[PDB]
DNA sequence: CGTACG
DNA sequence: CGTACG
């Protein structure tokens with residue numbers, strides 16, 4: 001869920 | 009210089 | 017040069 | 023799940 005790299 | 013990971 | 021999550 | 027610089 002969290003998006004800090006990919007943004008699942 | 010720029011710090012986005014390490015911050016040289 | 018290496019950090020950053022639910 | 024993978025991004026982010028001078």
Ligand SMILES: *C(=O)c1cnc2ccccc2n1
Nearest residue numbers: 001002003007008021022023
């Ligand atoms: C988002 O909250 C989230 C949490 N755990 C994960 C594990 C693996 C792939 C994606 C994920 N996304």
Ligand SMILES: *C(=O)c1cnc2ccccc2n1
Nearest residue numbers: 003004005006020021024025
């Ligand atoms: C994003 O590319 C990425 C990769 N590894 C991580 C590890 C821990 C937190 C966030 C992360 N984000």
Ligand SMILES: *C(=O)c1cnc2ccccc2n1
Nearest residue numbers: 009010011015016017027028
């Ligand atoms: C900062 O601006 C900066 C620019 N280039 C680098 C190359 C290698 C190591 C650190 C660096 N820091």
Ligand SMILES: *C(=O)c1cnc2ccccc2n1
Nearest residue numbers: 011012013014018019026027
């Ligand atoms: C910080 O850990 C890190 C690593 N690789 C990068 C590549 C491009 C831009 C910023 C980056 N930051």
